Amino acid sequence: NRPNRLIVDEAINEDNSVVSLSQPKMDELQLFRGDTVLLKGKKRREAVCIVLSDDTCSDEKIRMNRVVRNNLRVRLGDVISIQPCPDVKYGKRIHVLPIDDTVEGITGNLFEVYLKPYFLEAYRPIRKGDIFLVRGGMRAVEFKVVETDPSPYCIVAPDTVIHCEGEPIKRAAAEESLNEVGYDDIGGCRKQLAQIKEMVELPLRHPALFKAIGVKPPRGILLYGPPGTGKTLIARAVANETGAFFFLINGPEIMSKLAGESESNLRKAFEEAEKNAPAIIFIDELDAIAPKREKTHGEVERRIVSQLLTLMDGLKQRAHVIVMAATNRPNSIDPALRRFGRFDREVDIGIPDATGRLEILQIHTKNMKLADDVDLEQVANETHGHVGADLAALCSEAALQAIRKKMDLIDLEDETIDAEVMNSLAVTMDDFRWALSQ
Amino acid sequence: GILLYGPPGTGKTLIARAVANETGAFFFLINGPEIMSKLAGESESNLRKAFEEAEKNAPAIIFIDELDAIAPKREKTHGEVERRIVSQLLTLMDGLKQRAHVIVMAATNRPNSIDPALRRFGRFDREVDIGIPDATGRLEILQIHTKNMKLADDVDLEQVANETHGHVGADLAALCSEAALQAIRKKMDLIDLEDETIDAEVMNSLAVTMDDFRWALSQ
Amino acid sequence: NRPNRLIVDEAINEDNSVVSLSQPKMDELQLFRGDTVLLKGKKRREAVCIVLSDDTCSDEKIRMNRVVRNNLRVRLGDVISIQPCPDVKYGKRIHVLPIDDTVEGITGNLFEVYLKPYFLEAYRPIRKGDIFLVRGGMRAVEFKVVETDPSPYCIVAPDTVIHCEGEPIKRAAAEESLNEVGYDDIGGCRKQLAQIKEMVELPLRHPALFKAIGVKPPR
Amino acid sequence: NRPNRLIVDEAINEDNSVVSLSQPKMDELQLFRGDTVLLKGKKRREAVCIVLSDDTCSDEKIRMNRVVRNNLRVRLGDVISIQPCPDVKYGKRIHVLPIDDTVEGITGNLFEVYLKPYFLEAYRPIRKGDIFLVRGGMRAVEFKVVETDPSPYCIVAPDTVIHCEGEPIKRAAAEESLNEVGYDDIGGCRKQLAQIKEMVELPLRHPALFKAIGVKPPRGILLYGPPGTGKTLIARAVANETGAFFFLINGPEIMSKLAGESESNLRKAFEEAEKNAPAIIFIDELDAIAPKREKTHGEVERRIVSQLLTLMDGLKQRAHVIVMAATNRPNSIDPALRRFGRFDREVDIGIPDATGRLEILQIHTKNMKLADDVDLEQVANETHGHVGADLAALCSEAALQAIRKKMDLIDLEDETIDAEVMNSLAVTMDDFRWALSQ
Amino acid sequence: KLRIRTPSGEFLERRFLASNKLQIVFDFVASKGFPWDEYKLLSTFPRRDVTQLDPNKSLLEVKLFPQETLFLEAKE
Amino acid sequence: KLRIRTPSGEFLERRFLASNKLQIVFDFVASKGFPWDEYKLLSTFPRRDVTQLDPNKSLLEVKLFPQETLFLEAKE
Ligand SMILES: Nc1ncnc2c1ncn2[C@@H]1O[C@H](COP(=O)(O)OP(=O)(O)O)[C@@H](O)[C@H]1O
Ligand SMILES: Nc1ncnc2c1ncn2[C@@H]1O[C@H](COP(=O)(O)OP(=O)(O)O)[C@@H](O)[C@H]1O
Ligand SMILES: Nc1ncnc2c1ncn2[C@@H]1O[C@H](COP(=O)(O)OP(=O)(O)O)[C@@H](O)[C@H]1O
Ligand SMILES: Nc1ncnc2c1ncn2[C@@H]1O[C@H](COP(=O)(O)OP(=O)(O)O)[C@@H](O)[C@H]1O
């Protein structure tokens, strides 16, 4: 409508305090790099951020991280309003408190470990009632801004007093965990993720439309790839990002149950999804439930496959349920699953390139202090033929080595490390080397 | 008994339902998977029930979808409960009196899929091959599936028909859907103003363009 | 902290009365080959041993057999304190009794079979409340030192009277069987054992850490 | 020391008159965008060009197209000298003549078709004795600058008289065809091409080194990929770009010969290569000569495999011969070929991504007039699973359709088209569509 | 910083802030005997005619690179 | 065009050509009560301290964007 309205898009820069616009749009709106902007979203929520320019950003779109989106209570594809906020005063006193779930087990001075370096010389704009995320000591903590010096907005500047009262707040019902999986946790499947996004856009984000139109939305999406490529991740992310109910069916779980309990659980899954729609069902290890008729020895197994087919077929268009399933290759599974109504769409999540590996490594080192000696590009380059799971494990193994080495040196009075010492602990390239060498 | 043999998506279920509607006959659908999902006798009961119901509301067409699920060849039929079901079907078919005014239509991929007993004199004694369509047929199918759609002048359904080599009806139908949804998706971005999730009117104002088809064909 | 603190490591020499240090560390602590040392561990438990030098021993580590570890109530990877104990007096009378489980079926004079050759010209340092292990006659017997001449420590020297009262003692809850399997019972898998050790170190020996961190340990 | 010396690198911009430097280097040398520069190379050859700035260009390197390299008689990795040339005067009269090979069959006014739009408002610096390349009418013509107004250099400016006398010049021995295959003709195998480049650098470009050192250079490189991925291209390009003798062995050809004639031809190939070293031998369809011992029915076939092994083994390090061979998969060929001395290195040339497809399409439309309606990106996107050969053929088919359509309209007095009308003919998107639809 | 060449090939140098409208550049060329009517301002690599670009747009918006060589030709 | 913020958070605006040495910017901040010794000039997104960058380098070379917000903090 008005040019101040833009469409929420994914973020190139992962800094909580940054939003991105096309230079055209910035010019049009007379915005200068670094200008504090005020963003308005749903539930009359508001947020203040720093604007920068992204070449890739479409003129009608804004790029914001998931922190901002949550604060504005918007999802990807929603519309927001942007206005300048030049009245930003270096506020004197801010009061921030952590959310309980995020700080369980953490036993540090949250200020020194999290808050201090977050805000330090950042000149970060903050608003009351904002929840922000600080990563470190192999964790990520969510803090809510309980009070700010100027009541609406403030810039946390060097002399800004940051106060933590030290009583962890509860999580309100509308507040979503930033520890939930999102697209930002998935690296390397850009194009595939994009396809799936498009597929689920209308059915999940705009269900009503299907009452008005006779066009049939895609019902089943089959994610084929080797193990550890992030198929489960993708499904969960899509659910979270579209705000859809997620029901997990795990092949082994189903097959562990006796006789009808299998099929009951299957039906129940479908029914539950139908009820909490819009919904995504994810079938992990579909090959376990529904192999080819050749490999299907025994009648109980055939019954289960049959049930699944019927269940899929029984999904009405108005049910607003998408079923996503993961398997190794299409040749793994009974071809009936690929019929018109059933898994009619396939996406291939494959082994990533070095570029993708780098993104994956980045994702899995985000809560880690990495020494300057760490060359994730090197790691990316040498880790030929590795899938996400491999890389993730490599990062773990490196961390644990680091910890192991330090635990030996904590033979003095020092406790089992600590949140602080964990935050002081840097994973070094040698740690990665140990892992790669193992 | 009429046996409709063809690859998936050729419109076997369509044909049966159409014939029923056009002749004004009761239509009972038996779906292989559904039957086989049931436990033990519940399978065979449901089979009997289908036949009985049809007999009652005759003239009637029974359609067996995915007949290969109910009645594979004796080789592929591992286990006795499965053999019982095939047997039941044979008996049920045989038990159909001429006076019953019931035709049974069944769909499968190839005659070699199914137990040859089904092709005996009384049983599925007639076969029709519904095959992959020619370009001419593809065009008709595209036309059918764009009938409720506003198509821009740029749309060349003949082009689409020509380039969609080896596509069956289901493929074409899906292509049309995908094109529509793309169109909607594009417009939903522009409805960022004040308008709700489209509308009957805006849906009617929305034209699917050749680019929309192109996106679909390219996907 | 203080250099007297070291990390418990596996033992190259399986003699109950021997602990091993790097020569550097021995020099640093001014320790002479054969010097009796006093080791302090958890539950305020204590033990006295003979120190020797191992080339392979890392400077920050001590090598002790499983006997010692149990007496110090420490496990591999724990920290202990080492101080010299030059006040070791050839004690006159020690009283040792076997643990019941270890002597079931054994029908000898424990002295002649086990105790005598264990201590004989060994000049072994002993402390009260120590459990030691003597191997022979296709068995291994655990004896507890119930009383020593000088109350804390003693060196069992030739003229030392060794007395067994002949009532087998019960096993207290904190006391672990030396007939349990340990790394000392595994030969040939050095490198593989090392890998597994590392794998289980943090999850088994330091579980708490996993509350504070989001890294996933090997399952 | 001296900073005017730079290392010849591949070219991002394919304009004949452009060379690229890092801005740092341009600043260091006080160069302004568009400044005419004089480049000095081997055989005391010289060239004048326009300088621009490439981000990717390493400070110590210069990017120049193959036209320039040839004019400077340098190869990739050579060193050149750059000096400013501000004394360049808009020259009055230049005289250019085409090389015979390039113009065979061309029957146009070379001026209007090639020369005019090349120079038009380009303000191109030219030097006497330069050979430049103009692409059009599904051909590329090489012209030599025979005379220029100011004797050394000139800028061809609007009023510059361009004269073509119309006697095609012969090709001198040092002058290389720009119709020869080079890296610029290979799209999509960036990383693989880079590896091969490194492999052959020292043995082909610096053979002498192997007299001084005892390190063994790679002898055999095995290029594995599906058909049409450009394995033959790669080999020929590498040969051309390194200036090495290229001997082609084609499996079928060898196997067509009777008995010893096979093995003789094999030996001869090796001997010939040895003689004209540094050399690359390329074995096309190696699977024909050397299948696995299982599939090798008959003794004459086994003899040939054996011969090849011995021939490979018999290559002394000082021979300065690299053997490159192409096959579908390593499982195709006798495993003995992968021993230490033999094909000890494998590179996988795979199916290209859309990005690579676009490059390939660009390569194959370079001599073609494409209407504005042509969207090569579209073509690239929709041509999933296509290899280079597929794309190349698509471009041909589109061209020929275009020609076919026009040939109908040339039903008037006009002859079978012409160089001119061919140059006037544009391939349209519909032409591509026809091809894609076929 | 723009280096403009006369049709005789004489270099003319001037610096303008990117915020300056293209008209500022036009006036600069209009200072010498180069009217917008009688003369065109051409760009090479890329090839464009700045003359016909909107004068009100910023030098940044007319996509003129921090350094650009420009040429003058009579609109004849 | 650089917008520099005082430690009190007051915007100071000035335009310099990219060719201008960073020293020109230093002198501008040195105009107000902000000596190089007593005050630092910080950049955010990216995070850097321009104060310590070479004054002789061009504003383009010091990688200052055509628009950049900068901040002043006492070197304490
Ligand atoms: N593309 C990816 N980007 C980031 N992490 C990934 C990716 N693929 C896998 N992982 C990591 O591997 C873990 C296991 O992968 P998972 O989602 O189970 O995939 P799959 O379903 O193929 O086994 C994920 O939680 C994540 O840590
Ligand atoms: N010939 C056709 N004409 C129109 N639509 C068709 C045709 N063939 C297939 N379809 C479409 O594909 C869908 C799936 O085919 P269906 O009728 O179930 O037959 P089959 O049993 O061969 O899959 C049809 O409902 C219709 O949407
Ligand atoms: N590496 C070893 N060191 C010591 N004893 C061993 C070793 N390997 C096997 N043994 C002996 O062999 C017996 C069988 O060992 P066990 O753990 O059952 O092996 P596995 O699980 O491989 O069958 C054990 O009683 C043990 O005495
Ligand atoms: N990567 C590529 N870049 C450019 N052209 C290619 C590429 N791959 C294939 N081609 C085209 O296809 C033709 C056949 O390639 P060729 O070298 O014979 O491949 P292969 O050796 O795998 O059969 C080449 O002449 C070229 O035009």
DSSP assignment of A242-269 equals HT-EEEEEEHHHHHHS-THHHHHHHHHH
E18 touches chain F (CB under 8 A): yes
CB F41 within 8 A of CB F50: yes
Indicate which of F15, F17, F68 best probes the interface with E, i.e. most E CBs within 10 Å of its own CB.
Answer: F17
Given an 8 Å threshold on Cβ–Cβ distance, is F3 in contact with A32? Answer: yes
C partners (3+ CB pairs within 8 A) are A
Pure H helices in F1-76:
22-31
Residues forming a β-bridge with A321:
A279
Instruction: Go through C122-161 and write b for each residue having 16 or more CB atoms within 10 A of its CB, e for each that does not.
Output: bbbbbbbebbbbbeeeeeebbbbbbebbbeebbbbbeebe
Dist CA A377 CA A357 (whole Å): 9
Dist CA E5 CA E7 (whole Å): 6
Ramachandran quadrant class, C139 (left: phi over 0; alpha: psi -120 to 50; beta: rest): beta
- Residue D347 tokens read as 């590179």
- Cβ contacts from A onto C, under 8 A: 53
Q: CA of F58, closest CA in chain A: separation in Å?
A: 20
Amino acid at C152: P
- Tell me if residue B53 falls in helix, strand or coil: helix
DSSP H or E stretch at residue D247: strand D245-250
Amino acid at C65: N
State whether the beta carbon of A388 lies less than 6 angstroms from ligand 1: yes
Rounded to 10 degrees, the C-alpha dihedral E49/E52/E57/E60 comes to: 0
Please compute, for residue B147, the number of CA atoms within 13 A of its CA located in the half-sphere on the CB side. Answer: 6
| Annotated binding residues of B for ATP | 8-14, 109, 145
CA–centroid distance for C161 within its chain: 23
- Tell me if residue B116 falls in helix, strand or coil: helix
Question: Which among B13, B14, B30, B145 is the best mutation to test ligand 2's pocket, defined by most ligand atoms within 8 Å of the CB?
Answer: B14
Closest CA relative to residue B39, chosen from A259, A257, A290: A259
Residues forming a β-bridge with D81:
D5, D40
Residues 6+ apart with CB under 8 A from E37: E75
- Residue A325 tokens read as 């399933």
Closest CA relative to residue D148, chosen from D81, D80, D114, D97: D97
- Tell me if residue A184 falls in helix, strand or coil: helix
Dist CA A322 CA A242 (whole Å): 12
Query: What is the gyration radius of the CA atoms in chain A, in angstroms?
Result: 24
Dist CA A105 CA E3 (whole Å): 65
Q: Do chains D and C touch (3 or more CB pairs under 8 A)?
A: no
Dist CA E39 CA E30 (whole Å): 9
Dist CA C67 CA A416 (whole Å): 26
Residue with tokens 């049959």: A306
| Residues of chain D with C-beta less than 8 angstroms from the C-beta of B162 | 437
B159 touches chain D (CB under 8 A): yes
A105 touches chain C (CB under 8 A): yes
Ramachandran quadrant class, D259 (left: phi over 0; alpha: psi -120 to 50; beta: rest): left
Q: How far is CA F15 from CA A86, A251, F41, in A?
A: 20, 65, 16
DSSP string, D346-406: EEE--PPPHHHHHHHHHHTTTTS-B-TT--HHHHHHH-TT--HHHHHHHHHHHHHHHHHHH
> What was the structure determination method?
X-ray
| Residues of chain D with C-beta less than 8 angstroms from the C-beta of B211 | none
**Per DSSP, which regions of D151-225 are E strands?**
153-156, 161-163, 220-224
Residues 6+ apart with CB under 8 A from A166: none
Q: Nearest 5 degrees, angle CA E21-CA E27-CA E32?
A: 150
What phi and psi, each to the nearest 5 degrees, are found at residue B62? -95, 135
State whether the beta carbon of B8 lies less than 6 angstroms from ligand 2: yes
D349 CA: nearest ligand 4 atom: 22
Rounded to the nearest angstrom, the distance between the alpha carbon of C186 and the centre of ligand 3 is 8
Sheet holding D139-148, edge to edge: D131-136, D139-148, D93-98, D161-163
Residue with tokens 């994730």: A376
- Tell me if residue B85 falls in helix, strand or coil: helix
User: Peptide bond preceding B59: is omega within 30 degrees of 0, i.e. cis?
Assistant: yes
CB D325 within 8 A of CB D286: yes
Distance spanning both ends of chain F, measured CA to CA: 28
Amino acid at B129: D
CB B88 within 8 A of CB B47: yes
State whether the beta carbon of A188 lies less than 6 angstroms from ligand 1: yes
> Which residue minimizes the CA distance to atom 15 of ligand 3?
C186
Sheet holding A131-136, edge to edge: A131-136, A139-148, A93-98, A161-163
Dist CA A283 CA B210 (whole Å): 36
Q: How far is CA E12 from CA A182, A419, E65, in A?
A: 56, 65, 17
What phi and psi, each to the nearest 5 degrees, are found at residue A204? -90, -45
| Residues of chain F with C-beta less than 8 angstroms from the C-beta of A123 | 5, 42, 44, 71
| Residues of chain B with C-beta less than 8 angstroms from the C-beta of D378 | 214, 218
| Residues of chain C with C-beta less than 8 angstroms from the C-beta of A404 | 198, 201-202
> Which residue minimizes the CA distance to atom 12 of ligand 2?
B170
Q: Centre a 10 Å sphere on the Cβ of residue A146 and count the other Cβ atoms it contains.
A: 17
- Tell me if residue A108 falls in helix, strand or coil: coil
Rounded to 10 degrees, the C-alpha dihedral D162/D168/D170/D172 comes to: 20
CB B149 within 8 A of CB B216: no
Closest partner residue to E3 among D18, D32, D52, by Cβ? D32
- Residue A110 tokens read as 């949250």
- Residue A206 tokens read as 């705009």
Q: Which residue of chain A is at minimal alpha-carbon distance from F11?
A: A86
CB D194 within 8 A of CB D77: no
- Residue D202 per-residue DSSP state: I
Say if strands D124-127 and D153-156 run parallel, antiparallel, or are unpaired.
Answer: antiparallel
Indicate which of A201, A267, A292, A303 best probes the interface with B, i.e. most B CBs within 10 Å of its own CB.
Answer: A303
Reported residue count of chain D is 438
Task: Say which ligand is closest to the CA of A362.
Answer: 1
> In a 10 Å sphere around its CB, with 0-12 CB exposed, 13-18 middle and 19+ buried, how is residue A347 labelled?
buried
Q: Centre a 10 Å sphere on the Cβ of residue A312 and count the other Cβ atoms it contains.
A: 22
Residue with tokens 């361009």: D162
Q: How far is CA F38 from CA F7, F25, F29, F73, F76, in A?
A: 12, 16, 11, 8, 7
| Residues of chain A with C-beta less than 8 angstroms from the C-beta of B148 | 214
| Residues of chain F with C-beta less than 8 angstroms from the C-beta of E18 | 66
Q: CA of F12, closest CA in chain E: separation in Å?
A: 18
Rounded to 10 degrees, the C-alpha dihedral A363/A364/A368/A369 comes to: -70
Closest CA relative to residue C145, chosen from C85, C71, C73, C90: C71
Residues forming a β-bridge with B31:
B65
Dist CA A227 CA B103 (whole Å): 49
CB D94 within 8 A of CB D148: yes
Helix B80-95 and helix A299-314: axis angle, to 10°?
60
CB C118 within 8 A of CB C134: yes
Reported residue count of chain C is 219
State whether the beta carbon of A189 lies less than 6 angstroms from ligand 1: yes
DSSP H or E stretch at residue D101: helix D100-103
Pure H helices in A243-387:
251-256, 260-275, 286-289, 299-314, 354-363, 376-382
Rounded to the nearest angstrom, the distance between the alpha carbon of D319 and the centre of ligand 3 is 57
Dist CA B1 CA B15 (whole Å): 15
Q: Centre a 10 Å sphere on the Cβ of residue D331 and count the other Cβ atoms it contains.
A: 9
CB D87 within 8 A of CB D57: no
Resolution in A: 3.1
Dist CA D35 CA D53 (whole Å): 11
Indicate which of E3, E49, E67, E75 best probes the interface with D, i.e. most D CBs within 10 Å of its own CB.
Answer: E67
Q: Do chains E and F touch (3 or more CB pairs under 8 A)?
A: yes
Contacts 24+ apart (CB under 8 A), A263-271: A263/A303, A263/A304, A263/A307, A263/B37, A266/A304, A266/A307, A266/A308, A266/A311, A267/A307, A267/A311, A270/A311, A270/A314, A270/A315, A270/A321
Dist CA E64 CA E14 (whole Å): 14
Residues forming a β-bridge with D156:
D124
Dist CA A400 CA A138 (whole Å): 11
Residues forming a β-bridge with D377:
none
Q: Centre a 10 Å sphere on the Cβ of residue A15 and count the other Cβ atoms it contains.
A: 17
Given an 8 Å threshold on Cβ–Cβ distance, is E17 in contact with F18? Answer: no
**Per DSSP, which regions of F1-76 are E strands?**
2-5, 11-14, 39-43, 48-49, 68-74
Dist CA A125 CA A47 (whole Å): 9
Query: What is the gyration radius of the CA atoms in chain E, in angstroms?
Result: 11
What phi and psi, each to the nearest 5 degrees, are found at residue A360? -65, -45
Instruction: Go through D286-303 and write b for each residue having 16 or more CB atoms within 10 A of its CB, e for each that does not.
Output: bbbbbbeeeeeeeeebee
> Which residue minimizes the CA distance to atom 23 of ligand 1?
A228
Q: How far is CA A312 from CA A267, A287, A290, A305, in A?
A: 10, 16, 13, 11
Q: Which residue of chain D is at minimal alpha-carbon distance from B158?
A: D437
Instruction: Go through B19-55 and write b for each residue having 16 or more CB atoms within 10 A of its CB, e for each that does not.
Output: bbeeeebbbbebbbbbbbbbeeeebbeebeebbeebb
Amino acid at E47: R
DSSP string, B163-184: H-TT--HHHHHHHHHHHHHHHH
CB C71 within 8 A of CB C130: yes
B170 CA: nearest ligand 2 atom: 12
Residue with tokens 């011992």: D293
Q: CA of F31, closest CA in chain A: separation in Å?
A: 23
Rounded to the nearest angstrom, the distance between the alpha carbon of D140 and the centre of ligand 4 is 19
Dist CA D87 CA C29 (whole Å): 82
Closest partner residue to A106 among C208, C212, C217, by Cβ? C212
Distance spanning both ends of chain B, measured CA to CA: 40
- Tell me if residue A206 falls in helix, strand or coil: coil
Reported residue count of chain B is 219
- Residue E2 tokens read as 């723009």
DSSP H or E stretch at residue D305: helix D299-314
Given an 8 Å threshold on Cβ–Cβ distance, is A306 in contact with B36? Answer: yes
Given an 8 Å threshold on Cβ–Cβ distance, is A400 in contact with C1? Answer: no
DSSP H or E stretch at residue C211: helix C209-212
What phi and psi, each to the nearest 5 degrees, are found at residue C114? -95, -70
Closest CA relative to residue D255, chosen from D312, D323, D303, D215: D303
D381 touches chain B (CB under 8 A): yes
Closest partner residue to E44 among D32, D34, D35, by Cβ? D34
Say if strands A93-98 and D153-156 run parallel, antiparallel, or are unpaired.
Answer: unpaired
- Tell me if residue C48 falls in helix, strand or coil: strand
Rounded to the nearest angstrom, the distance between the alpha carbon of B10 and the centre of ligand 2 is 5
Task: Say which ligand is closest to the CA of D231.
Answer: 4
Q: Which residue of chain A is at minimal alpha-carbon distance from F46?
A: A122
Q: How far is CA D67 from CA C50, D16, D50, D184, in A?
A: 83, 6, 14, 11
